[PDB]
A paper describes a structure:
[name] converts 4′-phosphopantothenate to 4′-phosphopantetheine in three steps. The product of [name] is then decarboxylated by CoaC, an enzyme of the homo-oligomeric flavin-containing decarboxylase (HFCD) protein family, to 4′-phosphopantetheine.
Screening for crystallisation conditions allowed us to find a different [name] containing condition that gave excellent resolution (1.8 Å). The small differences (RMSD = 1.147 Å) in overall structure of [name] dimers in the full-length MsmCoaBC and the MsmCoaB crystal structure solved at 1.8 Å can be attributed to artefacts of crystal packing. Hence this crystallisation system could be used to validate [name] inhibitors binding outside of the [name] site. Nevertheless, a flexible loop (residues 362–377) that covers the 4′-phosphopantothenate site, when this substrate binds to the enzyme, can be seen in our MsmCoaB structure, extending away from the active site. A superposition of our MsmCoaB dimer structure with MsmCoaBC shows the loop extending towards the CoaC active site. This long loop (15–16 amino acids) is present in all CoaBCs and it is possible that it helps channelling the substrate from the [name] to the CoaC active site. While magnesium or manganese are the favoured cations for [name] activity, calcium is observed in our structures instead, due to the high concentration present in the crystallisation condition.
Numbering used by the authors:
A (entry chain A): 184 to 293, 300 to 364, 374 to 412
B (entry chain B): 184 to 412
The structure:
Amino acid sequence: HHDMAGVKALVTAGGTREPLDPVRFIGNRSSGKQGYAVARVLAQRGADVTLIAGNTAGLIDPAGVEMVHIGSATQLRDAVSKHAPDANVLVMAAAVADFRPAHVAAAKIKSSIDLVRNDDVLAGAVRARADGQLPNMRAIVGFAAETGDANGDVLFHARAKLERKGCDLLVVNAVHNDGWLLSADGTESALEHGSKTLMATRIVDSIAAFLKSQ
Amino acid sequence: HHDMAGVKALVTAGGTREPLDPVRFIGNRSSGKQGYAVARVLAQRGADVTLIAGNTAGLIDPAGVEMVHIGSATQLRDAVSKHAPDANVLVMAAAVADFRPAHVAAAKIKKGASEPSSIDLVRNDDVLAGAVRARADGQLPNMRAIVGFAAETGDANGDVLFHARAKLERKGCDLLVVNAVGENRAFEVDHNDGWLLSADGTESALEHGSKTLMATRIVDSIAAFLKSQ
Ligand SMILES: Nc1ccn([C@@H]2O[C@H](COP(=O)(O)OP(=O)(O)OP(=O)(O)O)[C@@H](O)[C@H]2O)c(=O)n1
Ligand SMILES: Nc1ccn([C@@H]2O[C@H](COP(=O)(O)OP(=O)(O)OP(=O)(O)O)[C@@H](O)[C@H]2O)c(=O)n1
Ligand SMILES: [Ca+2]
Ligand SMILES: [Ca+2]
């Protein structure tokens, strides 16, 4: 039915672009499709959805969703801050750049590129809510792409990321391999590889169950 | 009619992406749409078109055009090398990255706690200049027209036409399409700075109109150049 009726949901999706000059940037390969899918399913289930979108694979605005377009990780941060005070659910599906060029050239570059860190927006929301600044925020959802490497298997890294971020739910993609839904209470649920819509339904199901538990 | 009948055209379009690791890259804001429009007009007018496409995942493949997909400027270079021997016209509409990161990480660079490491850059080969030189060295006997594209702006050192003329003579191409950019949309300002520059000294204004109109003017200019020879 419409379980999300009355819920205000803030979703980020797509990759950010960190400018080097007016023409060039550091970007990433995120398509935004999974984040758009979650926004679409939330709206379909009655939520009042605001979608902050960075760079996407040409995607169409989902119907009934309020669109906010950003470029950089800092612009995404400011857009999340602007829209956070009344949101009940934050879904951080955007591939947010960890670093940005330290200097942006005023004109086209005809030179090593120095980098500085961007703010961790997801962690900022978790801390703000813990510090009493987001009383309406009932669920904070992070996304992660994890792989096994010489320092640990994929699930080890995913669990560590849940613990460090402190969010309520971590949607993990193992990079047709299945992913995971990791909850802050320790629940771990396999996320089967299906269409983006079916996976979005499973993600939103988990959000709805978490909201009912609280 | 079909003036481009019998012409084999190799077109590059879109921006390139220069990897930092499997997920991140240096990129640019070019859409590839103007180059796609030139390929589409060439085919509509009878040309046998091969389109080497960069960062254009959401664009529709032009009908009747052979598609070649590349990622980086070096991959674009290699694709042009492979396909140029078949072409009579090379249309270099791609926004090719001048630089690439010197090191490509095997895995996505992790957010540590120490200071982030700068990115060293290295120059990518000038594909257009490489084609001009190969033709001059006798390696491209079928190549009748080499077309470059450039976005130029006036700055403290000169206006658009000053910079554009200098780039044409410098690149050594037969035609330089200057500022075939913009979408002619509401609230988009037209700086009336579009030009078609020929290596014989002819200079014609390129009106900023739709992508299809500009592609038609560009292909008209190619046809006029081919007929001049
Ligand atoms: N500057 C950033 C970076 C990431 N994110 C959010 O954090 C989650 C992904 O974090 P991740 O990149 O996996 O964690 P990092 O601390 O950056 O660790 P890593 O070294 O693996 O990149 C996503 O929800 C993403 O939207 C964010 O809010 N702000
Ligand atoms: N590594 C490169 C760079 C650009 N091009 C081609 O060169 C033309 C545009 O050149 P432009 O970027 O305007 O001149 P540059 O020599 O790169 O000078 P600038 O730094 O001003 O860009 C286009 O046709 C583009 O496809 C190319 O073949 N190989
Ligand atoms: Ca990161
Ligand atoms: Ca350039």
